[PDB]
Amino acid sequence: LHLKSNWSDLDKAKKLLLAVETTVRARVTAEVDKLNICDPQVQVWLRRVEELQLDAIDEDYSQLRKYSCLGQCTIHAHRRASIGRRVLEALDEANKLIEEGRRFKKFGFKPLPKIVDPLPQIKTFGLETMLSQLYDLFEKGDSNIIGVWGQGGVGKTTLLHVFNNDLEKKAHDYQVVIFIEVSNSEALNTVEIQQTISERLNLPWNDAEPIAKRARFLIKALGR
């Protein structure tokens, strides 16, 4: 009688599959904590495992076990073929899932940097008119360079923060939005700015690269 042995094997397969799912889910959660999006192949594997619904075949086998008192009672023997096929399908599907899951080594990938990077949102007061003027120059302006000036400590950096966070809501054709603080020095700390631009452009930052060569490379990169 291969049905009882195969069902015991199926139970062992459920336990092993649950263990593998727990391990892979733990690693995927670890990768997500690092802000890395889960690998799409691992997502497909998890979707297949979640849909295995072995409890349905288990409950059907329980219902058959309700009637599994005599083997000579061939009244219920027709259901054996259905069980005898679904059990094997579940078993080999579970074993395939096991083999695929055990071999996974990469569980996440760094997503492409967003178009707009959120910046602190301080409660503003009466910035709507200034925002409207800045947006008007930003959209209808025939000149690509826009300058904003005011007295020390008078809403400037805050204006930039609010404008940056508002670019998220509106639709636009600008691929990358970069926020650079040249305020950190009067000596033009070029390395810091190049690091910020490279980080916001998903470029591989290099330490030994000469400054002029990196400047040329970033000029070529931002020109596209």
Binding of ligand ATP by 153 (CB under 6 A): yes
Binding of ligand ATP by 149 (CB under 6 A): no
Q: Cβ of residue 160: shortest distance to a copy of itself, in angstroms?
A: 25
Tell me, by CB under 6 A, how many residues bind ligand ATP: 13
Alpha helices in the chain (DSSP H): 2-33, 40-50, 54-67, 79-102, 128-140, 156-167, 190-200, 211-222
Q: Cβ of residue 135: shortest distance to ligand ATP, in angstroms?
A: 16
Selected binder of ligand ATP within 155, 178, 179, 192 (CB under 6 A)? 155
Read off the tokens for 182: 């040249």
Distances from the Cα of 149 to the Cα of 128, 134, 138, 146, 158, angstroms? 17, 12, 15, 10, 13
Selected binder of ligand ATP within 6, 95, 124, 196 (CB under 6 A)? 124
| Alpha-carbon gap, residue 30 to 112, rounded angstroms | 19
Please report, as ranges, the residues that interact with a copy of itself according to CB under 8 A: 12, 15-16, 18-20, 22-23, 26, 29-30, 33-35, 39-41, 43-44, 47-48, 109, 112, 201-204, 217, 220-221, 224
Chosen from a copy of itself, ligand ATP, none, partner binding at 125 (C-beta under 5 to 8 Å by type): ligand ATP
Q: Cβ of residue 74: shortest distance to a copy of itself, in angstroms?
A: 25
Task: Please give the full DSSP string across 159-218, using - where no structure is assigned.
Answer: HHHHHHHHHTTS--S--------GGG-SS--HHHHHHHHHHHTT----SSS-HHHHHHHH
| Range 104-123, binding ligand ATP (CB under 6 A) | 122
- CA geometry: angle at 78 spanning 53 and 9, to 5°? 40
Q: Cβ of residue 48: shortest distance to ligand ATP, in angstroms?
A: 51
Selected binder of ligand ATP within 157, 184, 202, 206 (CB under 6 A)? 157
Q: In terms of Cα–Cα distance, which of 20, 7, 3, 5 is closest to 57?
A: 7
Q: Cβ of residue 190: shortest distance to a copy of itself, in angstroms?
A: 20
Binding of ligand ATP by 152 (CB under 6 A): yes
Provide the CA 40 distance to its chain's centre, in angstroms: 9
Distances from the Cα of 73 to the Cα of 23, 25, 64, 68, angstroms? 44, 45, 12, 9
Specify the residue, 68 or 158, whose C-beta has the smaller distance to ligand ATP.
158
Specify the residue, 64 or 159, whose C-beta has the smaller distance to ligand ATP.
159
Residues that bind ligand ATP in the complex, under the rule CB under 6 A: 122, 124-127, 152-158, 183
